[PDB]
Amino acid sequence: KSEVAHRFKDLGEENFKALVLIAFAQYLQQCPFEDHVKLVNEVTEFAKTCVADESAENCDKSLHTLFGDKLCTVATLRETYGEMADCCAKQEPERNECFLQHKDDNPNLPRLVRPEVDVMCTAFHDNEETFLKKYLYEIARRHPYFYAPELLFFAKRYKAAFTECCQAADKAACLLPKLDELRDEGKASSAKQRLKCASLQKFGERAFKAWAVARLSQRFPKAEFAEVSKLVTDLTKVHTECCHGDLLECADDRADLAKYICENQDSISSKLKECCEKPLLEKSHCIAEVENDEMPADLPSLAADFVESKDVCKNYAEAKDVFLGMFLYEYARRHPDYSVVLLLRLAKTYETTLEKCCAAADPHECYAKVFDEFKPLVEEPQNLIKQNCELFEQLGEYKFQNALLVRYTKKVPQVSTPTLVEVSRNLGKVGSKCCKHPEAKRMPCAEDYLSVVLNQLCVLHEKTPVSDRVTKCCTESLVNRRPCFSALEVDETYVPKEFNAKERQIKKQTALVELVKHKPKATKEQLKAVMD
Amino acid sequence: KSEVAHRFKDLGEENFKALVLIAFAQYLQQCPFEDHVKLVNEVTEFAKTCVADESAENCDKSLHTLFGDKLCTVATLRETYGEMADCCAKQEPERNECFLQHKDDNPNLPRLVRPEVDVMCTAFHDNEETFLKKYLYEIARRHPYFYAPELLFFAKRYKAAFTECCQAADKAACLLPKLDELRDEGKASSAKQRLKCASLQKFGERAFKAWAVARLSQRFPKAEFAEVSKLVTDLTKVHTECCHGDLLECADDRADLAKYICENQDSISSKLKECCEKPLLEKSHCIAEVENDEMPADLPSLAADFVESKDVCKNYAEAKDVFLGMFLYEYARRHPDYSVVLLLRLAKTYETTLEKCCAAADPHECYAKVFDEFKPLVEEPQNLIKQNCELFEQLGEYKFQNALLVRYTKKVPQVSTPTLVEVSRNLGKVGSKCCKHPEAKRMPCAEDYLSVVLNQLCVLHEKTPVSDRVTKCCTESLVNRRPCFSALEVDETYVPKEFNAETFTFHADICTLSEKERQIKKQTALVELVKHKPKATKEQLKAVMDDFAAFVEKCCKADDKETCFAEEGKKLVAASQAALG
Amino acid sequence: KSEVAHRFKDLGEENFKALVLIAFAQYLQQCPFEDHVKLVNEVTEFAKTCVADESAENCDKSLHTLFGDKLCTVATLRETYGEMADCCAKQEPERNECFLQHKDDNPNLPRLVRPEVDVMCTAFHDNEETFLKKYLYEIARRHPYFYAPELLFFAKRYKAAFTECCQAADKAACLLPKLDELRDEGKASSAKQRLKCASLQKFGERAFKAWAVARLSQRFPKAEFAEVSKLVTDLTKVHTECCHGDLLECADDRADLAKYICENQDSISSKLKECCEKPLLEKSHCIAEVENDEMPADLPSLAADFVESKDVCKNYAEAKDVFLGMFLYEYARRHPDYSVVLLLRLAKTYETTLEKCCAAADPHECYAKVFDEFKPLVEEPQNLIKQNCELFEQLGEYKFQNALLVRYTKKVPQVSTPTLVEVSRNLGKVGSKCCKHPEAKRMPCAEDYLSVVLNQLCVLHEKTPVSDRVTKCCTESLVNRRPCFSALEVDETYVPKEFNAETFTFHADICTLSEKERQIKKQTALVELVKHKPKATKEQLKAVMDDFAAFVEKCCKADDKETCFAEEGKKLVAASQAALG
Numbered sequence A: 001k002s003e004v005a006h007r008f009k010d011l012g013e014e015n016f017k018a019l020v021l022i023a024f025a026q027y028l029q030q031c032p033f034e035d036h037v038k039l040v041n042e043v044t045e046f047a048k049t050c051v052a053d054e055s056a057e058n059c060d061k062s063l064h065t066l067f068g069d070k071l072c073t074v075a076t077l078r079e080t081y082g083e084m085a086d087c088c089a090k091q092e093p094e095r096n097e098c099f100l101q102h103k104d105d106n107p108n109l110p111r112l113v114r115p116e117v118d119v120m121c122t123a124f125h126d127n128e129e130t131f132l133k134k135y136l137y138e139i140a141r142r143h144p145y146f147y148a149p150e151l152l153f154f155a156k157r158y159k160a161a162f163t164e165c166c167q168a169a170d171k172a173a174c175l176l177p178k179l180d181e182l183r184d185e186g187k188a189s190s191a192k193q194r195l196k197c198a199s200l201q202k203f204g205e206r207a208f209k210a211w212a213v214a215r216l217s218q219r220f221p222k223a224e225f226a227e228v229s230k231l232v233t234d235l236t237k238v239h240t241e242c243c244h245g246d247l248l249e250c251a252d253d254r255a256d257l258a259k260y261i262c263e264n265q266d267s268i269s270s271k272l273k274e275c276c277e278k279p280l281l282e283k284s285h286c287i288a289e290v291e292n293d294e295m296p297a298d299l300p301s302l303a304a305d306f307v308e309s310k311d312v313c314k315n316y317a318e319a320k321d322v323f324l325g326m327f328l329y330e331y332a333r334r335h336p337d338y339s340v341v342l343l344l345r346l347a348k349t350y351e352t353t354l355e356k357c358c359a360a361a362d363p364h365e366c367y368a369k370v371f372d373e374f375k376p377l378v379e380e381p382q383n384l385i386k387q388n389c390e391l392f393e394q395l396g397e398y399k400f401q402n403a404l405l406v407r408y409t410k411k412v413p414q415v416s417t418p419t420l421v422e423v424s425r426n427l428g429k430v431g432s433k434c435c436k437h438p439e440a441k442r443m444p445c446a447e448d449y450l451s452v453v454l455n456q457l458c459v460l461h462e463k464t465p466v467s468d469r470v471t472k473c474c475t476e477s478l479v480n481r482r483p484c485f486s487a488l489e490v491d492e493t494y495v496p497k498e499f500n501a502k503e504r505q506i507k508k509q510t511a512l513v514e515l516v517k518h519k520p521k522a523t524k525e526q527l528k529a530v531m532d
Numbered sequence B, C: 001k002s003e004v005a006h007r008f009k010d011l012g013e014e015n016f017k018a019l020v021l022i023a024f025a026q027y028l029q030q031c032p033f034e035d036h037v038k039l040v041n042e043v044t045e046f047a048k049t050c051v052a053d054e055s056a057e058n059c060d061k062s063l064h065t066l067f068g069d070k071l072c073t074v075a076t077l078r079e080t081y082g083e084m085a086d087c088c089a090k091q092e093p094e095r096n097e098c099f100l101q102h103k104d105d106n107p108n109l110p111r112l113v114r115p116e117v118d119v120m121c122t123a124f125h126d127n128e129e130t131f132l133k134k135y136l137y138e139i140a141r142r143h144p145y146f147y148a149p150e151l152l153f154f155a156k157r158y159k160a161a162f163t164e165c166c167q168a169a170d171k172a173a174c175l176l177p178k179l180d181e182l183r184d185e186g187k188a189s190s191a192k193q194r195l196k197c198a199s200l201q202k203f204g205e206r207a208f209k210a211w212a213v214a215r216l217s218q219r220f221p222k223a224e225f226a227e228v229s230k231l232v233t234d235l236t237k238v239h240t241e242c243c244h245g246d247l248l249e250c251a252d253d254r255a256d257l258a259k260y261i262c263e264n265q266d267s268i269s270s271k272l273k274e275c276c277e278k279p280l281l282e283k284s285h286c287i288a289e290v291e292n293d294e295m296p297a298d299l300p301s302l303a304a305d306f307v308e309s310k311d312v313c314k315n316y317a318e319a320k321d322v323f324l325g326m327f328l329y330e331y332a333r334r335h336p337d338y339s340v341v342l343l344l345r346l347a348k349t350y351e352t353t354l355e356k357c358c359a360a361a362d363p364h365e366c367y368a369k370v371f372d373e374f375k376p377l378v379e380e381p382q383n384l385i386k387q388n389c390e391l392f393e394q395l396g397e398y399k400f401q402n403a404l405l406v407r408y409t410k411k412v413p414q415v416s417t418p419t420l421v422e423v424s425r426n427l428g429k430v431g432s433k434c435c436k437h438p439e440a441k442r443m444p445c446a447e448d449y450l451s452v453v454l455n456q457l458c459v460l461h462e463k464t465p466v467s468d469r470v471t472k473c474c475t476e477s478l479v480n481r482r483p484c485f486s487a488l489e490v491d492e493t494y495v496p497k498e499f500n501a502e503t504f505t506f507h508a509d510i511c512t513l514s515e516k517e518r519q520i521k522k523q524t525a526l527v528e529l530v531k532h533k534p535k536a537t538k539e540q541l542k543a544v545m546d547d548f549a550a551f552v553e554k555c556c557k558a559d560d561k562e563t564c565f566a567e568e569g570k571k572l573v574a575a576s577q578a579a580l581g
């Protein structure tokens, strides 16, 4: 059996080559485009050889061994990758896993300078395939964890925008608002997948699956528990593969999962028919973003089975995570108006209550009160979004950003300035995108997006660690990252800074961070005035 | 014991505040928004005071007394309410009941102005709380009998439309269709509640309960008669409270009733599962419009117990309204295809038959043929709906409305023109609403909606009566209102109105109006025309309607718009005056 | 008693005129628009006479006689229909039937020119009535079997598109997408109706009815068999009327059937509620395409009554087609994931099994293995669709079409070139329409559509037969036409066509054509290429196609358009003619 031949045939030549390009650009982010183009062609010709004759040389090797061997030939001979070549002394599995630390979440790369639209349209028509490879290359090397099947989807949307607008009357009026929209969606997609990987790889399979159970139970509340569980198992496989760089198997398995879902809408959701009529890449993307289904008509009494019953400890002790998973499933399918991190916070609270109360005498009188525990947990984010969005409906995004900017620079000023500017702007952006949504979607939007942004901070900071408290909030609890950051207090240990004499806001937001780093003990009134 | 604190606790702070806003908006319809806001906050703080110490001052007075006192202070001080302050000389219970005549079913209020969609969306985002308070306020003062818990539901749907649409690409394409459907729903809900109050308050508890029995037996035909009767009794308490202004008790009791129904759904209907998993406002609303359950499969013969048996009279004399209630329950649970007013008509026919035949020597030989009486009573509404729906399908709604305008202006030309236009437009909306259904659902939709619309006519007319025939059809019989109006013929004792030139003068404001707005203006003119020349034939009127239709199509595409309407309009007036003079 | 009067009153004047226009346009396809307008107005004036007085001259004649007389006046007098005058010597019923062969499935008519969108919007405003008649006329003459009630539906959607888009800022951006979607739906509707007529008229009542049982049982699987059969009976009456030209009765009966279905939806399907709330034309259309209901949850085992029972033969022998119809009904209601032609193939296999096994000593041992015969029958279309859809998803519609062109030109090269291009393009559109569905809906869509498109081939070929194998596949078995055509291997006995130079000389007007126009010109040449050298392989043919694409790219991006084509045309044909012989 030739694994490379198997995946080439499943995926077809064009998806194969693009996925292979993404795989090398995300691991070898400093190599030039033309180097990766030749590499892709070599791999693709090797693959076709293996389709013709699976016994041909190296065709029976694992994609894991083959990808690493290719990587190691580059990094061994070249000098730009001296650190990564240290992995190449290892055997599998240590060698593949050693590659992960060399994925650079903030690569030091020049900003893409943009030709004129008519120029780009000309280049687009002149060689469409080369135009799109260069798109895949520039994005992938800048977002080394970008979800690979979704990047294929983005490339498709990118091309369709050039197809449409390069025939426009005002080509720029058509193209530029599309590319800006496309760029915004992609940054969010990248940051979301980065948290999927971090949750699975750093916090473990159980955490990733609990999160998947909650979100899928919200999205498909009519689905039976066994069906939700099956979907969570497949997704775990897909994202383990993608997050460890096995992009061919990931894309291939994601295709199979989309097909399984579309062949079984009658057991999953009434909202899928239009998704399941689109071609593969759009189909998977649509399914990932489909609106919540309506609730079934036969929901059980949650308090009957999990709080008021007297044999809860006996059912829990027979199968602890199954029982907790049923609780999470029943709770999330009933509350599409909750954030996922809140449901998980609630499920964990329920879990601690059972561990505690089932040891005591008369556990039922102990655990019957767990719903009361939930009340302040539900209110604290409700109060936080309400507060901060009210400041947001007052102060515009730019202003709201400077608010958070000042707030977080006070909390952790040991953090490097560009990290603080970057995270604070994204924090502000959550206000922009979530505050005006329907209340049945406010908390899901606002708090789950904050988790995405804080993961960016945790990932940037784990590379160059500068704040013990950040390390603490980042690593102590996945679901409690947001409250841990909210509850951080003003730093008492950082020394002020000496005096140093519409792209403009970032230089402005730079100095405001450098101002708070200069006079840390001030409050907002003085900080507003110095920039005025 | 503090009622205000009790209702505050059952309802929650924001349901309390919204219901108090509704209650004062419906009784003091002319006071501006900002006065009511300051009045609601005062009540709310009073309520919390009573939540703390139920022995605090006034905290032990009944909500009935507190509302009247608060009303009367406002009415004795602020002017614009010197008639309502006459009520304030009276003690309870006369004081509260006296307020009812000052509920204005047609208040003279400025038309709601509409900013741009994106502008409305911005106002909605800037202060979503005040946005919705103004909504409650503007609706309640225009619909002083709007069912208060349903108004809270509409406010949620209204908030949902803005949250769903104010981030759309094309906000207006999203928001305007929803708001117009909501407006349709709201008007119908208002008019239905108005009939619930009028039937209970004007015709009596027994009339209200009988209607309730018929409708709930259709909807819950597997329910035991005793279960139907319990629901009918709780609904009577709920609507007595709402219709007399006790909106806090009304809302609290409606919530308890939805609770009871959901906890007892396996004794009531299988269609309730979805409703009973919903939040409270959605829950109650869902229950009120749930589809009819299926009939039992093991029913006896209705005729055996009520017609064929020879001792009907013995069972009737033991308990007359109970026996009539059982007949009505049996007939209605079997006939979801009958309008409620028809079923009530049949129960009344049966009652009259028993009262007459039970006095006879051989009663069974007198009442056994009662089904023969029923047959013409079923066929007349069947025929009426069939023929009018065929007309509606030929004309579309706007022209069906115009056919009804002429018909009703001829029947009762003494009625005011805006009331004639209002009522006739709604009668045509019955066509749009009900004719689309197959014949099984057609009659319940069409005849009960007709009844709802004729009640609107009766309420506006009772205030300013101008026609004896209208007063007669309105008051002689609740359930026979529709046939009585259906059988009114042309008034031949009507003096045609004298010509008024400005009445038939049109201006380019026509072209600058939305469809609805231009329609009403043409319809207003069409009623005035018929009033000026009542003996004008259908084809004479179609002739003037063609001339005008061309007239406005030409003068809206006219180089100079206003001068066209003036120039060609006088040629139309003269041409029509001569064609009908 | 006057048939023309009865249908006039049932249909109303507007439906009646439109249907008469369609009837004459479909039988007299070469007569100009204004002739038909005059003819319809005279027929319409006669019908109104008959409504007013059913004894008036000619009012008691049959529609057949009246229609055929009017037809025969034009044909025997106006030298345009010389052949059609032959029918006119006959009497009814032979005269009316004789007309059918002169229905031209591919009339020789210039393509419709399209004015500018704003010009069309103007014409539509100025005389909507004439605009719509011209639409009905041009479609009906080009599609002489278009289902007449559905063409009324399409005209209403056509009007709504103009009503909406002609008040749009960018009229063309709104309207051209809608017109393109209506055209694609319309072409599919026409081809579907042509198979309904061909299956009924050529293959008989029993074949049409069995197909109808299968499709309605899939769609209405809760309905009782008696209810399915009633629907099938009525549908047989409807389509017999439409397919033989009796459009007034067909439309009248179809509306009665839609009414019957909507009055009895609780005996038929839970999915009909929304369809049954629409106006008549939308209602009938909606019902025709409503989604399949859910199967009952209390079905018995089909195998028990039809396979495992040991006295199948006794029950079959008592009532053979009823027993086979029950089988089909049971199998089809359980298998919405099977095409109708597969279900019919399975029923025919079951029928052959009973005929063979019921003569055996132990019939049960013989027919109890019938499910083993079904397995390869199910597998082959599943396999064929899976593979072809993968090819489609790797090529897209245009390339898929071109691949099918090569395959089918090799299969039946005697078939004319415009026919091969028409049929191959439509076969590729089956990929676009059906391959996007999950596999549970893929087979019904793809294989029944494949059958629709092959009937197009069969219908054009029956007129001008050039291939015995096409005639064999078209006439051997209705339900097996698709496997028969799928299994056709390359014609190894075809004599290649000579070389014609200007068949392969392309000119500058290529770049001046729309997307569909260039493809068809390119595809016409690709067929002629395969006819020139039927031995070449797809890679050899892709090569000649490859540089040809470049040839049109550069020569259209050229200073003098025509010059590059003429110059580089010689070299292209030269190297291609060298590359292949």
Ligand SMILES: CCCCC/C=C\C/C=C\CCCCCCCC(=O)O
Pocket (backbone or CB within 6 Å): A192, A193, A195, A196, A199, A208, A211, A212, A215, A235, A288, A444, A445, A448, A449, A452
């Ligand atoms: C908008 C909320 C932020 C996104 C959440 C990201 C990470 C959560 C971690 C676990 C994900 C595992 C299941 C993947 C489900 C895909 C749906 C989605 O795309 O969610």
Ligand SMILES: CCCCC/C=C\C/C=C\CCCCCCCC(=O)O
Pocket (backbone or CB within 6 Å): B192, B193, B195, B196, B199, B208, B211, B212, B215, B235, B288, B444, B445, B448, B449, B452
């Ligand atoms: C289309 C139906 C017409 C509505 C009838 C309106 C008024 C009915 C009069 C008396 C009803 C009193 C009982 C209340 C039942 C509520 C059901 C409903 O919501 O009706």
Ligand SMILES: CCCCC/C=C\C/C=C\CCCCCCCC(=O)O
Pocket (backbone or CB within 6 Å): C192, C193, C195, C196, C199, C208, C211, C212, C215, C235, C288, C289, C444, C445, C448, C449, C452
């Ligand atoms: C996509 C499948 C198309 C197949 C239809 C074509 C031919 C069918 C032959 C038999 C006609 C009898 C059924 C008539 C009603 C079916 C409605 C429909 O089917 O519209």
Ligand SMILES: CCCCCCCCCCCCCCCC(=O)O
Pocket (backbone or CB within 6 Å): A139, A142, A143, A154, A158, A179, A180, A182, A183, A184, A185, A186, A187, A190
């Ligand atoms: C402008 C080039 C094309 C971008 C438009 C589609 C981009 C899809 C992927 C989004 C990521 C964009 C890269 C941003 C660089 C960065 O944030 O570091």
Ligand SMILES: CCCCCCCCCCCCCCCC(=O)O
Pocket (backbone or CB within 6 Å): B112, B113, B114, B139, B142, B143, B154, B158, B179, B182, B183, B184, B185, B186, B187, B190
């Ligand atoms: C400013 C425009 C927004 C208001 C839209 C109305 C919301 C629908 C609520 C329905 C209740 C009854 C409305 C009828 C009003 C009237 O007749 O004056």
Ligand SMILES: CCCCCCCCCCCCCCCC(=O)O
Pocket (backbone or CB within 6 Å): C139, C142, C143, C154, C158, C179, C180, C182, C183, C184, C185, C186, C187, C190
């Ligand atoms: C782009 C041309 C639009 C013509 C009018 C659109 C309405 C579609 C009517 C569908 C009937 C079948 C149309 C196909 C006509 C043909 O094949 O020549």
Ligand SMILES: CCCCCCCCCCCCCCCC(=O)O
Pocket (backbone or CB within 6 Å): C206, C207, C209, C210, C213, C229, C232, C321, C322, C324, C325, C328, C344, C347, C348, C351
């Ligand atoms: C009385 C005749 C049969 C009663 C109703 C049956 C409906 C259609 C009849 C045709 C029978 C076709 C069933 C088998 C299909 C086949 O073998 O072709």
Ligand SMILES: N[C@@H](Cc1c[nH]c2ccccc12)C(=O)O
Pocket (backbone or CB within 6 Å): A384, A385, A388, A389, A404, A427, A428, A430, A431, A434, A446, A450, A485, A486, A487
């Ligand atoms: N995390 C922020 C709160 C916040 C920032 N941006 C937001 C956007 C929406 C809601 C809340 C927020 C804090 O520490 O308080």
Ligand SMILES: N[C@@H](Cc1c[nH]c2ccccc12)C(=O)O
Pocket (backbone or CB within 6 Å): B384, B385, B388, B389, B404, B407, B427, B428, B430, B431, B434, B435, B446, B450, B485, B486, B487
């Ligand atoms: N009440 C009307 C009939 C009518 C008006 N609107 C309707 C809607 C549907 C059915 C009947 C009607 C009359 O008797 O003149």
Ligand SMILES: N[C@@H](Cc1c[nH]c2ccccc12)C(=O)O
Pocket (backbone or CB within 6 Å): C384, C385, C388, C389, C404, C407, C427, C428, C430, C431, C434, C435, C446, C450, C485, C486, C487
């Ligand atoms: N009839 C074709 C198969 C085919 C053509 N178009 C299709 C679309 C979908 C599925 C199959 C097909 C063949 O056997 O050669």
Ligand SMILES: CCCCCCCC(=O)O
Pocket (backbone or CB within 6 Å): A206, A207, A209, A210, A213, A321, A324, A325, A328, A344, A347, A348, A351
């Ligand atoms: C899918 C297995 C996960 C168990 C869910 C428990 C929630 C948790 O406490 O994190």
Ligand SMILES: CCCCCCCC(=O)O
Pocket (backbone or CB within 6 Å): A004, A020, A023, A043, A046, A063, A064, A066, A067, A070, A245, A246, A247, A248, A249
């Ligand atoms: C020489 C073959 C290299 C295969 C690259 C596969 C990339 C991956 O999915 O890990």
Ligand SMILES: CCCCCCCC(=O)O
Pocket (backbone or CB within 6 Å): B206, B209, B210, B213, B321, B324, B325, B328, B344, B347, B348, B351
């Ligand atoms: C519950 C009391 C209602 C009485 C029903 C009898 C109907 C009638 O004759 O009016």
Ligand SMILES: CCCCCCCC(=O)O
Pocket (backbone or CB within 6 Å): B020, B023, B043, B046, B063, B064, B066, B067, B070, B245, B246, B247, B248, B249
């Ligand atoms: C000052 C207190 C007024 C009480 C308001 C209660 C409203 C009502 O339900 O009648």
Ligand SMILES: CCCCCCCC(=O)O
Pocket (backbone or CB within 6 Å): C019, C020, C023, C043, C046, C063, C064, C066, C067, C070, C245, C246, C247, C248, C249
């Ligand atoms: C002059 C008589 C013409 C009758 C038209 C009937 C059309 C059709 O055949 O249904």
